[PDB]
Amino acid sequence: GSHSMRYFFTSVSRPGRGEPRFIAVGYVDDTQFVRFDSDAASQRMEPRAPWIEQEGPEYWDGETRKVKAHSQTHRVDLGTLRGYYNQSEAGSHTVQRMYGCDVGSDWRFLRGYHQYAYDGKDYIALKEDLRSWTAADMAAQTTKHKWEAAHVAEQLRAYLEGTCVEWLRRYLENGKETLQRTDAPKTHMTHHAVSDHEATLRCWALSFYPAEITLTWQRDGEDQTQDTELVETRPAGDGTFQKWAAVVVPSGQEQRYTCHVQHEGLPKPLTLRWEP
Amino acid sequence: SAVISQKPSRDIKQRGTSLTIQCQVDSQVTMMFWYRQQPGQSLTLIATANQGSEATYESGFVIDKFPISRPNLTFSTLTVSNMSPEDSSIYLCSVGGSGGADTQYFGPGTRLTVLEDLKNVFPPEVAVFEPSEAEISHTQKATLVCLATGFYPDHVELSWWVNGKEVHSGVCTDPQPLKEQPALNDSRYALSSRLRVSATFWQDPRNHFRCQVQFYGLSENDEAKPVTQIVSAEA
Amino acid sequence: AQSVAQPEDQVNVAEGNPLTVKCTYSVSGNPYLFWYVQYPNRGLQFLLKYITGDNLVKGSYGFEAEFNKSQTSFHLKKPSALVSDSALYFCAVRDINSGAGSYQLTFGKGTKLSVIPNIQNPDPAVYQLRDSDKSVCLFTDFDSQDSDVYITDKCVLDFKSNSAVA
């Protein structure tokens, strides 16, 4: 299996008195390990996975230092962006930041990234080469020249190829019991008559990690991307995920229909067929 | 360019009291720090002023003694509680971004003089001295001299005004004032200054020459009254 | 860790000669370097910084410094000194590889630069000045090179001559 570390930051302006909202969360693959919330009492970076708790006070203090710099920078940013777009202080605006890194099965650097958005739309992003920027509009171009002068991309490449990669490895080792597991899907099928001459078949996948899964339905082994309701992969609450797919079927003809489950924890891909 | 107001600028207070120094900034900025430096000496970081939570303190500095508050990114205060003579120094508000390349700016500073006896605060006596006839003969020039004497604490600002208007050129004030009684623990100070011109400038009796010493002392909110004032003498 | 040594408290120079304020750095990772200046009764003012790229960095009033990895140095240089440049000068480093979240620059102790002005026409002579309403002594026009008796130090005005009072 390959692996990722990702940090997601969301800052939101609240017009007038008091302060804006800031939420930061860290992920290793699809497992949240940290958070900071500005409305929380502690004003510290907090653990959200038992394997990170064992980190020392020097870790937690440093991460609390850095996340406050992230927080304060985002607040500064909100005013600047309001200034670039010539916007009033009355409106509520959202800033979002995402950065992190992926590794191969060899646990070497595969790619790094750093994406930034304003009101739910791409503003500026670092390219896969990590030396140059992709600006969305004229305001972002103004930031691009400033970040180019400040050698921001050099600093990010250093973190993304170096520090990011090393801490991911450590987290994968320290949290191996949870992070390096692969819970395969527990599958089954259900049958419900919808009319006189129609039935609904629903293919269920439960209790699986990681989240990436593929559920196809097939009629005579031909793909059926039409006539098929697919709910989004959703979280169970216990660190595993859930999904289902479904098809409307002319009753009598249930044995022609197959559901195909692909997943990391499945040695071979599964194939289900209804059986009374 | 981030400009940093600090108010007050100078203040003299006594053992046991507490001063609350402010730091305003013309725009909103990421990191804020509180530094403390002796004149002509290294900077010592007190703490880091975090927006919306307790400041992170450096070893040797505790919140009980040094309260810090940061409501806005533009505004912060440092209070220094239960003061003593050793806490006397310049208190600097520093500011800057959290970027790698970003520059760290400082502010004008706040001079804090902490005293045990506030009754030893006396203002200066300003006496002007005339140029000798020997110097006029030798150089065709005239040097005026001004002596501030018998003042405490050490901080004053000496300047000359010719014909009721200030002059920086041809003027000189000492780097630092001198101790009148060097042996005592805390004695009074003395300061000198020079002004030079043409001989015909001085010989012209219609010309006016005045020495001006700003003495920063107490305020009217403290208990003749050795208040903050100007002292001046003419020739 | 990160630190800078400024191994010289006082540095002297004649007006118009080369001035050199020396700074070395020690850093675990890679350095961004900084220079700051302080004239009396003010905060530290920014001069220049080596971010990356060109090792020679030029700033203001003919100030410069070269990034020398081998000697681990970033000495401030200026070809011809003015008198207004007499000040407290601070070097400072930032370990760009640090991940510990201490964002402040780490400064040196400070080097005091004294740019002594030139005296073209030296003519040392004592004089005795009288109170217009008492007497004082004055040792003026000289070249740059007891408990109850008081003596002040050197002082220069602008023709430029030294002076000192008793």
Binding site: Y7, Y59, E63, H70, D77, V152, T163 | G99, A101 | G99
Partner: peptide, 9 residues
């Protein structure tokens, strides 16, 4: 672990 150097837009 978080990035250290964050530079404002």
């Amino acid at each position: 672990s978080l990035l250290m150097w964050i530079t404002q837009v």
